[PDB]
């Protein structure tokens, strides 16, 4: 059936069945995407619904214990496990299930199955693009979320002392992670995070302007005020005036797009670059390579007691966060800070 | 021929200029240039400003041992409060520098400039025969800027609580705001974050889908691809509908986050969930919300080193 | 022997402006950290 018109085998029949068009496109990558993603979602839900974190973190995080949607999470394993893969059949759990769920292995289960689900999803995007005969720019775009997930949930915990310092799958847990980076890593001051936030805000800006400009430069292709109905999806004529939009934005802003392909490629390119740079910054953080302090200003402040800048105030705030949060954030250190050593504004 | 005023208004309302000088432009241009000039001069060189009102100033100028990242235009002194502080109201120019006048001048002129910029957007939309709703979309960053620079100082009663005009000032303001109001736990900040993330997602997806479909104006094949991918057939098959959704999502998100900001300006904080899960005996069990509370408590104690003198921060 | 695979690189003014803006913005962002 191929180039040389040869016979058909098991692989041919499997390929014909898998790629058959239906409501739910399975594809070859479906065998990987569907079970992994299904078990990731199931693990997250059954963990945030029944499983607790009393023994791993000393916290109560579940619906059964009385937490709502915002303060429920699947917490990471205890710091004692370090970087253990923590299989249900592993030496830690010895095959037991209730101990395994009680020991924090459900986080590792969810994270690993979700990562493989992401891989399967990108493979599915590739398969769909090949089937429809289109350039697979969607997979190139989706590369950035995978990079962010790998940097934050896998590479960073591996660089640290264990899975304990990974983000936990929950809203309040993510907020804790964010504040932890602020207090300890000075993550706001890292230039890579600056480039990432610039990219994300620029992507939102581009989306807003493109939508408004397209919707405010339509051609009068029909009667009535409801312009949405005046559009035929099979038409071969442009639905908005590129020349008018170009002139308007060149006279308002100063520079305006003149190529549709370049415009949409720029929309694709900005956020992908932003999150890739954020991922590189997080990779740098994983090894404690922090853009924490400016040596010149620190020396000047130490020498001159009258020297104050917003940078020094941020340093003081970070020190306060660290000292007041590490007491309960990291139980395995067994830190007991006397009330007289905690940093505190003396004014009271 | 025509009188002087007729020629002047013909020149002003002319679409042949390189940059459209609208009737809103006649106010936008001077205010924006004044704000830009004062901001540049203050950033390059300006003496330390007594932001806290407790006779200790902070330096934010390049010529005063700062760099681009840590430089800022320090907000107005706390002692000034909400009083109008123009140059002519100060005994000397150095006093105006010390008390923090340039921040107030820049903020006022910049707010006027952005309002007139939105007006000029509408005006040039009108002069070219377009539907005039680009200004409505642009209002969301304008609303956010107004809430950051104007509404929050009004609610808190002083201009010293406004956002400093500097990179490190932004981070300090954000840490302050999370410490004092718990911004992260508010539904409106959650909606703003959702709007920003969704804007990035939809931008990337739309760019990729349109670029892939621009073979040797978007064809219907991209709609089929999207329907096959995420199992949402007929969700977006009209180009006008798709672009309207693209415009609507981030604008609504930013509107709601700005409204949440202005709401907290009047001391209406976000959700509070500390000491919620309680043991049968009565003991309190820690939750991730309690760890957030601990971080906020750590931020609050070192908030102002020597400004407070009473146990409760009513200000 | 002359190579059939011969091509010329082009860079319009827009690309030049983008590149100059990119390098200058990167220098502005990273100068504070490089000088420290």
């Amino acid at each position: 059936i191929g180039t040389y018109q040869e016979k058909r085998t098991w692989f041919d029949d499997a390929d014909d069945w898998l790629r058959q068009d239906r409501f739910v496109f399975v594809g070859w990558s479906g065998l990987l995407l569907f079970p992994c993603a299904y078990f990731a979602l199931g693990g997250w839900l059954t963990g945030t619904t029944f499983v607790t974190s009393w023994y791993t973190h000393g916290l109560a995080t579940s619906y059964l214990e009385g937490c709502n949607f915002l303060t429920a999470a699947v917490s990471t394993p205890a710091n004692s496990m370090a970087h253990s893969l923590l299989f249900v059949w592993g030496p830690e759990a010895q095959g037991d299930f209730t101990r395994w769920c009680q020991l924090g292995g459900l986080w590792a289960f969810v994270a690993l199955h979700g990562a493989f689900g992401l891989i399967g999803f990108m493979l599915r995007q590739f398969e769909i693009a090949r089937s429809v005969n289109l350039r697979p720019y969607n997979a190139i775009a989706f590369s950035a979320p995978i990079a962010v997930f790998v940097s934050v949930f896998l590479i960073y915990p591996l660089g640290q002392s264990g899975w304990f310092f990974a983000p936990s799958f929950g809203v309040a847990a993510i907020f804790r992670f964010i504040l932890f980076f602020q207090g300890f890593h000075n993550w706001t001051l890292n230039p890579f995070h600056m480039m990432g936030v610039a990219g994300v805000l620029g992507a939102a800006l581009l989306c807003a302007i493109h939508g408004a400009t397209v919707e405010n430069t339509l051609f009068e292709d029909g009667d009535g005020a409801n312009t949405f109905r005046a559009f035929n999806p099979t038409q071969a004529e442009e639905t908005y005036s590129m020349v008018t939009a170009n002139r308007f934005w060149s006279q308002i802003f100063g520079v305006a797009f003149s190529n549709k392909r370049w415009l949409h490629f720029f929309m694709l390119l900005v956020p992908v670059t932003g999150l890739w740079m954020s991922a590189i910054g997080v990779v740098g953080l994983a090894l404690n390579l922090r853009a924490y302090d400016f040596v010149s200003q620190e020396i000047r402040a130490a020498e001159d007691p009258e020297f104050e800048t917003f940078y020094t105030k941020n340093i003081l705030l970070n020190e306060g966060i660290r000292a007041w949060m590490a007491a309960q954030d990291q139980p395995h250190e067994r830190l007991v800070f006397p009330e007289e050593v905690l940093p505190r504004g003396n004014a009271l | 021929n025509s009188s002087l005023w007729a020629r002047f208004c013909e020149w002003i309302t002319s679409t042949e200029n390189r940059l459209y000088i609208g009737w809103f432009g006649v106010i936008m241009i001077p205010c924006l240039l004044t704000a830009t000039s004062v901001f540049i001069i203050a950033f390059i060189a300006a003496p330390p400003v007594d932001i806290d009102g407790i006779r200790e100033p902070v330096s934010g100028s390049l010529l005063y041992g700062n760099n681009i990242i840590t430089g800022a235009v320090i907000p107005t002194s706390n002692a000034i409060g909400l009083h109008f502080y123009p140059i002519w109201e100060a005994a000397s120019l150095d006093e105006w520098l010390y008390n923090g006048g340039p921040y107030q001048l820049i903020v006022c002129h910049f707010l006027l400039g952005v309002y007139c910029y939105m007006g000029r957007e509408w005006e040039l939309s009108f002069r070219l025969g377009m539907r005039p709703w680009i200004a409505v979309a642009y209002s969301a960053p304008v609303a956010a800027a107004s809430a950051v620079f104007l509404v929050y100082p009004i609610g808190q009663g002083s201009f010293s609580d406004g956002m400093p005009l500097g990179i490190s000032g932004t981070f300090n303001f954000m840490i302050v705001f999370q410490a004092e109001h718990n911004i992260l736990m508010h539904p409106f900040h959650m909606l703003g974050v959702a709007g920003v993330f969704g804007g990035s997602l939809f931008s990337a997806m739309h760019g990729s889908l349109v670029t892939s479909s621009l073979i040797r104006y978007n064809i219907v094949a991209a709609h089929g691809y999207f329907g096959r991918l995420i199992f949402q057939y007929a969700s977006f098959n009209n180009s006008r509908s798709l672009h309207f959704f693209l415009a609507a999502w981030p604008v609504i998100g930013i509107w709601f986050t700005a409204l949440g900001l202005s709401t907290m300006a009047f001391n209406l904080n976000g959700f509070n969930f500390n000491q919620s899960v309680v043991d049968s005996q009565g003991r309190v069990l820690n939750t991730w919300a309690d760890i957030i509370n601990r971080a906020n408590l750590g931020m609050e104690v070192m908030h102002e080193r020597n400004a407070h003198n009473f146990p409760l921060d009513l200000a | 022997r002359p190579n059939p695979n011969k091509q010329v690189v082009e860079l319009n003014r827009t690309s030049l402006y983008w590149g100059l803006l990119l390098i200058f913005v990167l220098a502005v962002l990273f100068s504070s950290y490089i000088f420290n």
Partner: peptide
């Protein structure tokens, strides 16, 4: 010294912005 470098960088960026706005390639066949 470093302040002069920062000022030069900012002035150069502003000059590039001005040149891009004004001395732009005229767009044809939009």
């Amino acid at each position: 010294m470093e302040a002069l470098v920062y000022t030069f960088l900012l002035v150069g960026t502003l000059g590039i912005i001005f040149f891009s706005i004004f001395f732009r390639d005229p767009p044809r066949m939009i």
